[PDB]
Design a protein around this ligand. Sequence first.
Ligand SMILES: CCOc1ccc2nc(S(N)(=O)=O)sc2c1
Ligand SMILES: [Zn+2]
Length: 257
Amino acid sequence: HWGYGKHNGPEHWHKDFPIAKGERQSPVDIDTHTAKYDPSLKPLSVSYDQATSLRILNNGHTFQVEFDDSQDKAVLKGGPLDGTYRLIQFHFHWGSLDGQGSEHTVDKKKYAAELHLVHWNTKYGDYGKAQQQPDGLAVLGIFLKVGSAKPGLQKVVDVLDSIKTKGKSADFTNFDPRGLLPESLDYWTYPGSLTTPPLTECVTWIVLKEPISVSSEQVLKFRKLNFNGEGEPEELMVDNWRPAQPLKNRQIKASFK
Ligand SMILES: CCOc1ccc2nc(S(N)(=O)=O)sc2c1
Ligand SMILES: [Zn+2]
């Protein structure tokens, strides 16, 4: 059904998913000159020491690395959040060229890609129930710019040939998502939505100010993935990002400046 092409891309999603035209859609442009420093926001607590990665999956829209979320292992807390949010997966959005690919923008700047670490609020007991609640999910967004390689990303890049096409998975154990973080945990935060269907308004977004650097070779390997399944016409998995949506009444808060 939905995807990222001319015929099924972001401009069409509202017909199956009317909340696409809602009041709290994501991503947004982060206007750094209107974001409000909030001295009461806490440092983020990213606690990934016990993370247990299990698998990597090409889901036809992105690839995702999934974790064991059946115990409090890898959790996000603090910052703007009230409870504890458990990591379930991360995935990326990227472009066909280094000058596009991120979902969020910063003063209209697009990055080459964006990493989303998806966490669910443990007060809701499971990820699927959390997806139905206004404060169900917290997604940590990290921009990727092209420059030096990110060594912590290479284990991911090297397995992508084994999941070229939609529906392929591979075991992916012992991956440490701490290797994908920038030095600083300074962030912006605002209330929003999933950026892909069903576009539910269930996300507290936490977008880090500092991008990570990845090499041109690393991002090129993302662009060799396919949206299609095996045996179908080849369609390169590129430009799997939703453009910025109207901010509406919302305020973006900053943890710094
Ligand atoms: C069953 C889980 O379903 C979904 C659907 C859409 C979706 N979008 C995001 S994002 N790009 O991080 O805002 S995470 C997510 C999970
Ligand atoms: Zn995403």
